[PDB]
């Protein structure tokens, strides 16, 4: 086509989706990770994670307001990945890398798994 | 903070939100523009338009499944802007610029209004 493109559009959309999340506006699911609960937008979760894409395209699970993750999942690791989904920013640290990598593998977030593998290999 | 950032993340999220829209997955509103209907995600509309942000943060309108736009709004102009919301790509042409600009003013999409004004000024 003969379209023009606004370079910052995708980043501005994501910034606004994060603002809606922070204000709990039109959030439609709560992700339960052991004792912790995280409110989010199903569409953002699906757009970022192979696992959520699978869950919310399921004819029964698409209608659930609560999703319980595997008990082995670390809440902090999930929190870091949820923030990454809404911001493109990953708070990767020596103290959380193993938890973040395990959570990204479970959530099927290949690019996160890739940088965790690379950061781990550099430290050995 | 000491975060790392994935450059293509925002663009990949938007591409997936557009894929969900094309497959009518978790769309939660229909925008009626005279004889035409457009299915969308309320969160994407709010993230792109001052008008939809106002509408869906309203305590009564947030729960509506159908929104009727002003009869003066051109369906093609709306279609072009809806595509832009989900892709960052604006199909701006000599034959549609007036309709696109009027629709962007109504929808409160300042960056679109700006490029329409600039393209019009260059042709006079």
């Amino acid at each position: 086509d003969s379209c023009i493109q606004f370079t910052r559009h995708a980043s501005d959309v994501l910034l606004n989706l994060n603002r809606l999340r922070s204000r709990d506006i039109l959030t439609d699911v709560v992700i339960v990770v052991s004792r912790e609960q995280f409110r989010a937008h199903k569409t953002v979760l699906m757009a970022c994670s192979g696992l959520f894409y699978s869950i919310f395209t399921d004819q029964l699970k698409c209608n659930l307001s609560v999703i319980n993750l595997d008990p082995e999942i670390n809440p902090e690791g999930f929190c870091i990945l949820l923030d990454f989904m809404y911001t493109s920013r990953l708070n990767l640290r020596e103290g959380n890398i193993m938890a973040v990598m395990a959570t990204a593998m479970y959530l099927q977030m290949e690019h996160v798994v890739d940088t965790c593998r690379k950061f781990i290999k550099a430290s050995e | 903070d000491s975060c790392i950032q994935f450059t293509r993340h925002a663009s990949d999220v938007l591409l997936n939100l557009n894929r969900l829209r094309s497959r009518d997955i978790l769309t939660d509103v229909v925008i009626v523009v005279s004889r035409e209907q457009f299915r969308a995600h309320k969160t994407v509309l709010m993230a792109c338009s001052g008008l939809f942000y106002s509408i869906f943060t309203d305590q009564l309108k947030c729960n509506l499944s159908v929104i009727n736009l002003d009869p003066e709004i051109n369906p093609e102009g709306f279609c072009i802007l809806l595509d832009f919301m989900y892709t960052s790509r604006l199909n701006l042409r000599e034959g549609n610029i007036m309709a696109v600009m009027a629709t962007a003013m109504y929808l409160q999409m300042e960056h679109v209004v700006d490029t329409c004004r600039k393209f019009i000024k260059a042709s006079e």
Binding site: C3, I4, Q5, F6, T7 | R89, L90, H111, T115
Partner: peptide, 4 residues
């Protein structure tokens, strides 16, 4: 705005 750019030509993509």
């Amino acid at each position: 705005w750019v030509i993509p």
